[PDB]
Amino acid sequence: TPDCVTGKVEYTKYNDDDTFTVKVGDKELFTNRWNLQSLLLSAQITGMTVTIKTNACHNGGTFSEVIFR
Amino acid sequence: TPDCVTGKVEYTKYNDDDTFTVKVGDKELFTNRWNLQSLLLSAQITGMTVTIKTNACHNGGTFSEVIFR
Amino acid sequence: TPDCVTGKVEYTKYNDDDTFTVKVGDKELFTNRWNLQSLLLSAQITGMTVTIKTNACHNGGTFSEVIFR
Amino acid sequence: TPDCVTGKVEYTKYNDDDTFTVKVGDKELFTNRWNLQSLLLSAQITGMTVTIKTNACHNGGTFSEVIFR
Amino acid sequence: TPDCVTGKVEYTKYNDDDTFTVKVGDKELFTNRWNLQSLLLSAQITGMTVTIKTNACHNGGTFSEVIFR
């Protein structure tokens, strides 16, 4: 899967349908993997750099691969 | 869903029916999504600013959408 | 449910039977709600003030309502 | 259950069979309760003092009761 | 099980099939044990030194034993 965006988590959002949204770089992407929620919040809180890998690299895109640096 | 309140979590409460209550701004709101409990406590401990989005924007109101900034 | 004790978490104990015990004020109380284990440990580690609400307000008493400040 | 060892967590080990091993004092003890893994790691990371209670108070001994302070 | 690599966690990666990848030393290894994900991220965030024990000691290798110091 190709890299989509890399950077710090600007904000996260829990959604009504139980998905989780993250804002990295200039993209707002969401995921439906439950384990990623607390992991992504930890990344946000501790200010790590993350790379999101996805084919749907656009606002509203979904993803399920993340690299925590 | 519209913004209801934005600010720091003053306090949280675990309820007998397992729902979770949060006090942000001047509203006391609750949620029945189990994943939000630890996330909201982290938000509280680390002092993040959160925005709660809900139609039931009033004390005793319920919610399931949150933005962590 | 009435207030029972308020204060910092003196210590916590994971029990053989999988219940969780907390020492706040002069009472030692236990709960069987899982989600409360990690939440209570976080409260302990970060030095939060908690209020436990329960009718069984006595050593060995059970509880399932907690307020985290 | 009697006290076995008290002190800081010197190290923890995740084992191939999903049990968790902890080194406190001069004993190396393991547990099969899944909830205790993250709790014990938090204890280790934050440098808490823990007391492990068990009858198998010897290297290779098992346990399921822990006091966190 | 023999030691494979020891060092801090360079980065971690959540994979689409819900396995978790970690980069320690010069090896990139992955695990399918769900409990290790948050534990490894904590290790990464807090900069602990970990030792991964495995027979598949090579890039792409799996593992399920970890020592956190």
Curated annotation (Swiss-Prot), chains A, B, C, D, E:
Q: Cystine bridges: which residues?
A: C4-C57
Question: GO BP, one example?
Answer: symbiont-mediated modulation of host virulence
Q: Name one GO molecular function term.
A: toxin activity
Query: In which compartments does the protein localize?
Result: Secreted
According to the UniProt record, one GO cellular component term is: extracellular region
Q: Which UniProt keywords apply?
A: Disulfide bond, Modulation of host virulence by virus, Secreted, Signal, Toxin, Viral exotoxin, Virulence
Q: Membrane-crossing residues?
A: none
Q: Which domain of life is it from?
A: Viruses
**Notes concerning its domains:** There are three Gb3-binding sites in each subunit B monomer, allowing for a tighter binding to the target cell. Binding sites 1 and 2 have higher binding affinities than site 3.
Question: Hey, which family's this protein in?
Answer: Belongs to the stxB family.
Biological role stated in the UniProt entry: The B subunit is responsible for the binding of the holotoxin to specific receptors on the target cell surface, such as globotriaosylceramide (Gb3) in human intestinal microvilli.
> What is the protein's quaternary organization?
Shiga-like toxin contains a single subunit A and five copies of subunit B.
Output this protein's name: Shiga-like toxin 1 subunit B
Q: Which organism is it from?
A: Bacteriophage H30
The organism's lineage is: Viruses
